[PDB]
Amino acid sequence: DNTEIIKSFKNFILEFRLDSQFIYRDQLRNNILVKNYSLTVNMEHLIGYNEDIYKKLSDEPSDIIPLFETAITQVAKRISILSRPTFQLILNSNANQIPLRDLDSEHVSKIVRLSGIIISTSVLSSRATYLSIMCRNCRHTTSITTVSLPRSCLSCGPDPYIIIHESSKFIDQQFLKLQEIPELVPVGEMPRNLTMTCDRYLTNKVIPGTRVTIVGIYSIYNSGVAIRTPYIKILGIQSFTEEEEEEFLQLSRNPKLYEILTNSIAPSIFGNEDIKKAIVCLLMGGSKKILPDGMRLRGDINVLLLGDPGTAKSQLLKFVEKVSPIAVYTSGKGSSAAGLTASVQRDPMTREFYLEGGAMVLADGGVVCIDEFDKMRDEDRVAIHEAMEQQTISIAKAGITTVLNSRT
Amino acid sequence: VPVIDLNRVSDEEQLLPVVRAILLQHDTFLLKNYANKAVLDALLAGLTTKDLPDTSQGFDANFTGTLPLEDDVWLEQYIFDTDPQLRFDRKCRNESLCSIYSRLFKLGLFFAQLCVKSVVSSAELQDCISTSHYATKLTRYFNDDYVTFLPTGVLTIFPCAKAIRYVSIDEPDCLLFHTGTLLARWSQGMHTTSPLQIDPRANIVSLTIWPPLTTPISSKGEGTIANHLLEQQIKAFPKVAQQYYPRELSILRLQDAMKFVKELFTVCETVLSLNALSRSTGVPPELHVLLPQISSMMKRKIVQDDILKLLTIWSDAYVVELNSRGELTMNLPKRDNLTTLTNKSRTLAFVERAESWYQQVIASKDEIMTDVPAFKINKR
Amino acid sequence: VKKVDDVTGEKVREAFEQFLEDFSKVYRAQIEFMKIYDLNTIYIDYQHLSMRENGALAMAISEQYYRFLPFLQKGLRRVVRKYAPELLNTSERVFQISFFNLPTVHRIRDIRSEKIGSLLSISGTVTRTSEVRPELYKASFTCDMCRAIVDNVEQSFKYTEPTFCPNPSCENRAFWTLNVTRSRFLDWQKVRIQENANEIPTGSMPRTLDVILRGDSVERAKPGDRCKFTGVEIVVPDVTQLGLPGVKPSSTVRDLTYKISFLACHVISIGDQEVFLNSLS
Amino acid sequence: LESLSNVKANSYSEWITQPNVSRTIARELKSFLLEYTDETGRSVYGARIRTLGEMNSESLEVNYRHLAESKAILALFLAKCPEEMLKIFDLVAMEATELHYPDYARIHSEIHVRISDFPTIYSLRELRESNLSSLVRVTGVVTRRTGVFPQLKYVKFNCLKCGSILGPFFQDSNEEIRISFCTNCKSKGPFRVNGEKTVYRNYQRVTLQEAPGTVPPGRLPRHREVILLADLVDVSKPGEEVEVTGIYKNNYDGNLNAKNGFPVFATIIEANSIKRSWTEEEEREFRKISRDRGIIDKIISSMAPSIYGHRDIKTAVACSLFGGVPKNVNGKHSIRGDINVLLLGDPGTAKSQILKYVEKTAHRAVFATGQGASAVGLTASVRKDPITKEWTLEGGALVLADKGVCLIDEFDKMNDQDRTSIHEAMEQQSISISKAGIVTTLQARCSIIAAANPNGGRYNSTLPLAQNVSLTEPILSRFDILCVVRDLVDEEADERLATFVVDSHVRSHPENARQRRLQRQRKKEEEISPIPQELLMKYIHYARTKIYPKLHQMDMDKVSRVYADLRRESISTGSFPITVRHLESILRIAESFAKMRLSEFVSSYDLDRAIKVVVDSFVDAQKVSVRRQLRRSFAIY
Ligand SMILES: Nc1ncnc2c1ncn2[C@@H]1O[C@H](COP(=O)(O)OP(=O)(O)O)[C@@H](O)[C@H]1O
Ligand SMILES: Nc1ncnc2c1ncn2[C@@H]1O[C@H](COP(=O)(O)OP(=O)(O)O)[C@@H](O)[C@H]1O
Ligand SMILES: [Zn+2]
Ligand SMILES: [Zn+2]
Ligand SMILES: [Zn+2]
């Protein structure tokens, strides 16, 4: 029965044609030549090629994805033999993404699509993928591909087998933390975090503060009466309408665009045209440049409002936080260097220390709004000096040291 | 709210299924793109700015004329019926009001016929409303806090569907069509209606349609439709009814108190049952503790006098012994605390007692008071 | 098969029942009051208990209270079945006894191992309190092999599974299913108190102690109050005894450490002309 | 069968669990759902089921009174064994929904029925062991909110010694179930949960705290754990006030039996339905009161009757109590709706006991002392969850006072950092924080009433306000009304004050009895106030809830010229930092004055009184030499 599924995958790889070319076969051959044992399968082509296997994958991928891995491995080995390890499945998709807050007990073991920002990444971990074991009682050997060792020998007492280390294979794995965009979080709520796991070629592709699009499987694992920690098996990470493009180009073509936008910044406030234009410039921001020696010019524009109280200075920041696509608003009094900048904290779910981004790390590529700036402590200001002038944050805590970039 | 558009549904074979489908689920619908609506807007402007009501007309026992009301509000009302047996000689004095009335009627008669054909299964009443046999009431508020009202007609039509509540209606460009009590009554259970809430100071004109009022309410009853309309007007306008129908007003008002005491008994049953099942003992609690919860269930203020009114009708209702604290108590009389069959039996016994006492009161030749007298517990 | 009987306990129960029947019947009026007002705990004045048999009954009850308490509880529940059986009804015979008005009040200073298992009264200033919790007084279990039920499994100071399946046709042991509906629970609270200022001489530090309250007496202790407690001393397991010098006994290996706590049944806080005047001779 | 379930053979659980009784009451429930007597309204439950199937939701709200009226003992069974009744009533509702909309089970597994209008309400401190496993309805304030996590509902196990799969078990959220014998092996061997054949549910845990105005004297606030299941998540957020109906059950089994002495557990409430309102009898009396001519003066005289004089302070207190309109103009712009009041003056001027009236009058009031408060404590505190070990945030005093008022006594003597923590709360009505990776903003929509002493402890009338206090112009700019008090001496004023105070101390001294004592208390209230105080509290709540006066530009000049006059007089004198924020105070206090009449529009008289109050407050704070000139410079107003 599953032989038909394998044959269908083989056809979808070898014989599928798009743009008058065998795009999947050619891309897998190119990956083999590069020696990258991974295949990026597009779900939009899969649904158009065969709907029944798509239904099976969408409803019960539990056996389908082992079939995907083994079929891709076999087909790639056939291609390598024709031209002259287990190949990883990578999924690219553009279907509608379910909100993170809408994930429930009904999407168990179902492949879903998500989007969010990475706030923490763990160190790499080595996991077994192929084992050879020997019985200590009688030296009988066998191979095994959650996995657990056999309780009895196949030829010896309970638990007789031991692992032959020099005849086994292992793979890497990384643990990731995803959360919803704070701009999409209504006030009065802490953004929901989500645990994600990736392995082999999908590791180390993101750092905290990165905004990504996810294709993966919703699942749970045991780590409250029956509060099983949910986690995501990462399958694919990605990181305007034509009429919208025309509308915004006409807006650019407007002979009075600059003044229109200047008035558009806080129209419910009077005057203050100079600071309005300066805030417009801040919203657009500068252009990045790189020196020939490798150093980067900070393109961010930082403006200090230093006037008398009651001059609509707070209202301007609160309005920008609405307007900017990426915006973070926090008070100087209620913040700290460990909160504004990155910090190292231990993850209770995986019992490991994690590098966790701060508020300014979350604002990477955007604008942060800070108020009562004169009232923060000097150490926080020293860290903000680095954040402003070098676009980096230096962390030296416990027994680890690291530097993390922040284009805020 | 369903909307009917004449640009797409104007024929009888088009309107009748749509009207039937609306009335099987709703009691109110909208009319759009009627040709006279543009003229109706100008006529409404003329009435509300130039053609003020004739305040010197006065008001009569027929509930027609210009009735002054509270807050200097005036109500201009006229009634017309094809049957000469009813003396509605007080026809409308203003030509703009008649212009609105005619333009409303021209389509409202057909729509009322459509509604009757849709929901009324009586073949004898399919054409009960027509050009030869119809009765209409023209109503116009005026100002020189919403009021709950329930038209008794087959269909109610408003030239402007704005500021009307049931949720509010804010469709000025559509006319409002509302079904009354008679249409639901003749629907034999296939259609029901609900009362509406409107602003009495919004100067809104309204029209309601009946068959000729000499027609009886039903073949199973002796009173005519005019009797039901008279009852509704007496209930709505006590000041006018006092000069002409005092005893009828009292008789009609006493029923509300009867329903009140019945629902009070219904609430008290649940309250006492929940109090009894929340204790390992049957000791009667003090009344002042029960009173807030009783009032909350009743959704209006309840006092000791209202409780004592129950003892007046059904003496075997509750045990009202007085505690050593001097605080009045109440408890179920049944020894075996409660049984659902006995609960229903006691409710029916109270209902029978209340109905018998109501009949006794209305059968007395003396003028009727509209409230139940309170019982007096023997002082100790 | 007949179990071993405490003849002294039986005599004590009989004397207690006779005291309940003959004392004047104010306590039967209290029972009726509890039935009227749906009350769980009865209260007994200690000086009323100490006026029968020249107080020898009270002395015997007090000096071994943790032993004799079940007999008095049985006597009181037999009396309540005799006169107010409706209190056995639920929606199942939870019942408490609280003695008060002790003649002697003992300090945290004067706590001794000799006082264990005896009725005494203490006083101290409250410093910390914990929130109230339910306590598993009596539990019931259903068998796993068969589906028999075991009722009245008293949980004496520890989680105690039944030691046997009552029907000899079943061999169940060490495995049971806990009932949470037919089982009954009671309120729980711990009070952390401090020795009073007038007790400690200058240059001496105040002693601290933990006091246990259960039932309706809970929440009557407030921080900063000069509260007064009545009950019996009981030892509880301790984990901080490790590392101390000296030889430590062992069981055979198992540990047998202890520390002292006070269990109180009655709670009162020390503090209108006639009310005050009527308490003076 | 019918009416045969009424026989009480034993306790209710012993009777409900019988399959015949269950079938009989299920038939009765089906009859109730299919037909109900609501006269002209028809069978409303049928329409509710139809519209639920239309709306693709699981909430079938059921009025308790309806079922109690129609079926006496059927509701009483739910009143004592709610879980058992709901267990089959869910199936009855499911089949009823599938009658109208077939294949409803294809998308929805179950129907989560919700109870409404349950007539018995208990506080979070009134729960007792006698109410265990019963249905309760409590009211509280959300303080701390956990995340949403999946939890098992029907669990199946795999035996290690055989390939057979054990039967389904329901997760009651009581204990981590662990079977002891396999149905086939009869062995005590290991078992593991078969996840692939297990049905889950959503889980969230929220703490409900006693309302700030309901804490009893001298005790810490009580709170309980409330469990939200079956799509009842995210119904509330910190700072919100909610009432919830649920089941009082015990689930803290485990090491607690040995860690703490003796076997004990802890109680939780599993939520069934939750809700975040005036009878005609109250609105009628409110509208009777509203029509009195000059109602504003009665309201002003009603604030703190036992405090003599200080009318210019009492008016500000009343205006802050009523508040204004939080005009979120076009959404993209916002304005604070509440008035901020500062009471500055010499000792012996009741700057503190006024706050002991706002705390007892407003619906939700929080009181704090300057040196007894911390910046973390007022705004928000960080916590680690005892279950998930995650970083969590708990709101402070300002978050608790959301949609209320926050009181700060001795505002001058608090340290500078705690004073700085109030900056964002005074204008944004929110708390912004970044601690331990938590980045969020909470609602702090509260007014602030502050009392302080001048520099040196006595006000120097010869020196400006900007010199008599240790505060600064920024902090002063966040206020609207500044009330300056001098304890100057005069025989007539002192005689009046003393003869008022001695009679107040005569009144406040001690000396159907309940009714008689309430009558005597209201007599004493009448002796000193024109409005009964309970009625005043209800009136304030009603005005804040219902009345939202709108503005008209009929009197633009009368406000603009006053603003220009104030700015001109502040150009070269040490005085209040008069800015646009102070202009908004006139409008907001005019709105508050209008909201006392319950008028829907801002009239000229309201603006006149507003201008009077603002101009008098500005003038009464200048130095002596300039005060007697500005007395005549603003004689127009
Ligand atoms: N030019 C202006 N137009 C409209 N409103 C203004 C203007 N200037 C100030 N405001 C008012 O001032 C308030 C903002 O003050 P804010 O800047 O928060 O005070 P602070 O400077 O003490 O933080 C807003 O409510 C706004 O209505
Ligand atoms: N205007 C007043 N009328 C009546 N009593 C007053 C007045 N001012 C002060 N008192 C009395 O003096 C006391 C002042 O207390 P407090 O509010 O602490 O003073 P302050 O806060 O002004 O230092 C109150 O108990 C009050 O009874
Ligand atoms: Zn072997
Ligand atoms: Zn057994
Ligand atoms: Zn097995």
User: Residues A234, A248: contact at Cβ < 8 Å?
Assistant: no
C-alpha span between D317 and D328 (Å, rounded): 24
Give the residue from D133, D165, D199 where a domain finishes: D199
User: Residues D140, D242: contact at Cβ < 8 Å?
Assistant: yes
- Assess if residue D7 is contained within a domain: no
For residue D540, give both structure tokens.
């304030």
Give the residue from D162, D178, D199 where a domain finishes: D199
User: Residues D575, D567: contact at Cβ < 8 Å?
Assistant: no
User: Residues D342, D351: contact at Cβ < 8 Å?
Assistant: no
For residues D410 and D544, state if they share a domain.
yes
Is C89 close to B280, i.e. CB distance below 8 A?
A: yes
Pairing of strands D365-369, D404-409: parallel
Per-residue DSSP letter, C114: G
For residues D236 and D362, state if they share a domain.
no
Closest CA to C229 of C258, C199, C196, C191: C191
Number of Cβ atoms within 10 Å of the Cβ of B289 = 12
Per-residue DSSP letter, B59: B
Give the residue from D224, D247, D276 where a domain finishes: D276
C-alpha span between A160 and A140 (Å, rounded): 10
Is A108 close to D427, i.e. CB distance below 8 A?
A: no
Ligand with an atom nearest the CA of residue A371: 1
For residue B58, give both structure tokens.
């006065």
Q: What residues form DSSP beta bridges with D484?
A: D344
Closest CA to A170 of A86, A56, A102: A86
C45 CB contacts (<8 Å, ≥6 apart)?
C99, C100, C101
Resolution (A): 3.7
For residue B321, give both structure tokens.
């012994």
Q: What is the largest CA-CA distance in chain C?
A: 71
Our CA-based measurement puts residue C95 at a distance from the nearest CA of chain B, in whole angstroms, of 14
**Structural domains counted in chain D:** 4
- Assess if residue D204 is contained within a domain: yes
Specify the residue with its C-alpha closest to ligand 1, atom 25.
D335
Q: Residue D314 is inside which H or E element, if any? A: helix D311-322
C-alpha span between D178 and D190 (Å, rounded): 10
C-alpha span between B336 and B346 (Å, rounded): 14
Closest CA to D90 of D106, D112, D105, D116: D112
C-alpha span between A228 and C255 (Å, rounded): 36
C-alpha span between C100 and C6 (Å, rounded): 27
For residues D327 and D187, state if they share a domain.
no
Pairing of strands D404-409, C41-45: unpaired
Question: To the nearest 10°, the Cα dihedral for A223, A224, A226, A228?
Answer: -40
User: Residues B176, B28: contact at Cβ < 8 Å?
Assistant: yes
B113 CB contacts (<8 Å, ≥6 apart)?
B127, B129, B130
In the PDB record, what is the listed experimental method? cryo-EM
For residue C52, give both structure tokens.
């029968």
Ligand 2: which of D343, D353, D499 to mutate, judged by most atoms within 8 Å of the beta carbon? Answer: D353
C-alpha span between D171 and D155 (Å, rounded): 7
For residues D237 and D192, state if they share a domain.
no
Query: Can you give the CATH number for the domain in which D63 is found?
Result: 3.30.1640.10
For residues D378 and D249, state if they share a domain.
no
Closest CA to B350 of B253, B267, B240: B267
C-alpha span between D405 and D426 (Å, rounded): 11
Q: What are phi and psi of C265, to 5 degrees?
A: -100, -25
For residues D184 and D286, state if they share a domain.
no
Tokens 């003649």 sit on residue: C103
- Assess if residue D584 is contained within a domain: yes
C-alpha span between B348 and B344 (Å, rounded): 6
D75 inside 8 A of chain B by CB: yes
Closest CA to C116 of C234, C266, C264: C234
Q: What are phi and psi of D274, to 5 degrees?
A: -140, 150
Our CA-based measurement puts residue D24 at a distance from the nearest CA of chain C, in whole angstroms, of 22
Closest CA to A191 of D438, D240, D142: D438
Taking the CA of residue D409 as reference, the ligand 2 atom at the shortest distance is 21
For residues D172 and D38, state if they share a domain.
no
For residues D487 and D572, state if they share a domain.
yes
Is C159 close to D258, i.e. CB distance below 8 A?
A: yes
Query: Can you give the CATH number for the domain in which D361 is found?
Result: 3.40.50.300
Ligand with an atom nearest the CA of residue A141: 3
Q: What is the largest CA-CA distance in chain D?
A: 103
For residue D399, give both structure tokens.
């978050």
Closest CA to A114 of A98, A135, A125, A95: A98
D419 CB contacts (<8 Å, ≥6 apart)?
D411, D475
For residues D420 and D551, state if they share a domain.
yes
- Assess if residue D13 is contained within a domain: no
- Assess if residue D12 is contained within a domain: no
* CA-to-CA separations, B210 to B27, B91, B155, B367, D559, in angstroms, rounded: 16, 17, 8, 33, 57
3-state secondary structure of C136: strand
User: Residues B264, B306: contact at Cβ < 8 Å?
Assistant: yes
User: Residues A195, A71: contact at Cβ < 8 Å?
Assistant: no
C-alpha span between D72 and B338 (Å, rounded): 9
3-state secondary structure D497-515: HHHHHHHHHHHHCCCCHHH
For residue C153, give both structure tokens.
């499994």
Residue C247 has, within 13 A of its CA and on its CB side, a CA count of 2
D12 CB contacts (<8 Å, ≥6 apart)?
C91, D77, D80, D81
Residue B101 has, within 13 A of its CA and on its CB side, a CA count of 21
Residue D50 is which amino acid? R
Give the DSSP per-residue string, C10-33. HHHHHHHHHHHHH---HHHHHHHH
Strands of the sheet containing B175-179, edge to edge, are B3-5, B28-32, B175-179, B155-158, B205-210, B135-143, B73-81, B65-68
Q: What residues form DSSP beta bridges with A166?
A: none
A131 CB contacts (<8 Å, ≥6 apart)?
A143, A144, A145, A147, A163, A164, A168, A169
User: Which residues of chain B lie closer than 8 angstroms to D71, CB-CB?
Assistant: 340
Tokens 């069968």 sit on residue: D1
- Assess if residue D62 is contained within a domain: yes
C-alpha span between D523 and D520 (Å, rounded): 5
Closest CA to A314 of D416, D429, D377, D588: D429
C-alpha span between C221 and D261 (Å, rounded): 19
Closest CA to B151 of B86, B218, B229, B81: B229
Number of Cβ atoms within 10 Å of the Cβ of D355 = 23
Residue A266 has, within 13 A of its CA and on its CB side, a CA count of 23
Residue D579 has, within 13 A of its CA and on its CB side, a CA count of 15
Closest CA to B375 of B285, B317, B306, B300: B306
3-state secondary structure of A403: strand
Q: Which residues surround ligand 3, an ion (CB under 5 A)?
A: A 135, 137-138, 140, 153, 155-156
User: Residues D96, B247: contact at Cβ < 8 Å?
Assistant: no
> Least CB-CB distance to A190: which of D199, D427, D438?
D438
Give the DSSP per-residue string, D440-482. EEEE--EEEEEEE--GGGS--TTS-HHHHSS--HHHHHT-SEE
C248 CB contacts (<8 Å, ≥6 apart)?
C241
* CA-to-CA separations, C213 to C134, C191, D125, D231, in angstroms, rounded: 11, 7, 18, 40
Q: What is the largest CA-CA distance in chain B?
A: 78
Domains defined for chain C, CATH in brackets: 4-85+92-104 (3.30.1640.10), 105-133+187-238+257-271 (2.40.50.140), 134-186 (no CATH)
Give A141 Cα–ligand 3 centroid separation in angstroms.
8
Question: To the nearest 10°, the Cα dihedral for B339, B340, B345, B347?
Answer: 110
Taking the CA of residue D347 as reference, the ligand 2 atom at the shortest distance is 23
Domain span at residue D301 reads 277-637
User: Residues C112, C96: contact at Cβ < 8 Å?
Assistant: no
Q: What are phi and psi of A371, to 5 degrees?
A: -130, 155
First to last CA, chain B: 61
Question: To the nearest 10°, the Cα dihedral for C105, C233, D261, C162?
Answer: -140
C276 CB contacts (<8 Å, ≥6 apart)?
none
Handedness of CA D190, D195, D200, D205 (dihedral sign): positive
- Assess if residue D71 is contained within a domain: yes
The radius of gyration of chain A's CA atoms, rounded to the nearest angstrom, is: 27
A288 CB contacts (<8 Å, ≥6 apart)?
A296, A297, A299
Our CA-based measurement puts residue A360 at a distance from the nearest CA of chain D, in whole angstroms, of 10
For residues D113 and D168, state if they share a domain.
no
* CA-to-CA separations, D262 to C98, C156, C159, in angstroms, rounded: 19, 8, 8
Taking the CA of residue D451 as reference, the ligand 2 atom at the shortest distance is 21
D337 CB contacts (<8 Å, ≥6 apart)?
D323, D324, D325, D326, D327, D445, D588
Q: What residues form DSSP beta bridges with D116?
A: D63
For residues D177 and D271, state if they share a domain.
no
D474 CB contacts (<8 Å, ≥6 apart)?
A309, D423, D577
Q: Give me the helices (H) in A175-300, please.
A: 242-253, 257-264, 273-284
Per-residue DSSP letter, D605: H
Handedness of CA D556, D559, D561, D567 (dihedral sign): negative
- Assess if residue D3 is contained within a domain: no
For residue D597, give both structure tokens.
């009449």
C-alpha span between B319 and C159 (Å, rounded): 49
For residues D486 and D364, state if they share a domain.
yes
C-alpha span between A352 and A359 (Å, rounded): 22
